[PDB]
Design a protein around this ligand. Structure first.
Ligand code: 8RY
Length: 121
């Protein structure tokens, strides 16, 4: 089908845009607090607290598998990273504060990407 090629051309390009977004969001985490899954060896009880772990590396694997259908799905993973962190860690920790900063700073990027995805369909 010629239509499913053109579809795959869009999905491919959504992936292209989202990858740039991912890189921008991640740049706002220079301490690499959110780069890899929370270690279940280092935090054995983590899954008793957080039912849906998320991290930048895991987002990237999905991204490269063209597993994101739209910006919303991508944004919901980004929010997971932040919301998980602000639940698991108390307010006055370096982790919680890094989440707040990433949330605020990533907000600009996500406001851009929403408009640009709407524009170019
Ligand atoms: C987002 N990272 C965390 O929440 C974390 N919490 C405790 C130890 C290591 N990492």
């Amino acid at each position: 089908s010629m239509e499913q090629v053109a579809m795959e051309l869009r999905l491919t390009e959504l992936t292209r845009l989202l990858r740039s977004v991912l890189d921008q969001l991640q740049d706002k985490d220079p301490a690499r607090i959110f780069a890899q899954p929370v270690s279940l060896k280092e935090v054995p009880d983590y899954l008793d607290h957080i039912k849906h772990p998320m991290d930048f590396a895991t987002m990237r694997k999905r991204l490269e598998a063209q597993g994101y259908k739209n910006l919303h799905e991508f944004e919901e993973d980004f929010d997971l990273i932040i919301d998980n962190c602000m639940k698991y860690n108390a307010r006055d920790t370096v982790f919680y504060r890094a989440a707040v900063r990433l949330r605020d700073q990533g907000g600009v990027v996500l406001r851009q990407a929403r408009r640009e995805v709407d524009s170019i369909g």
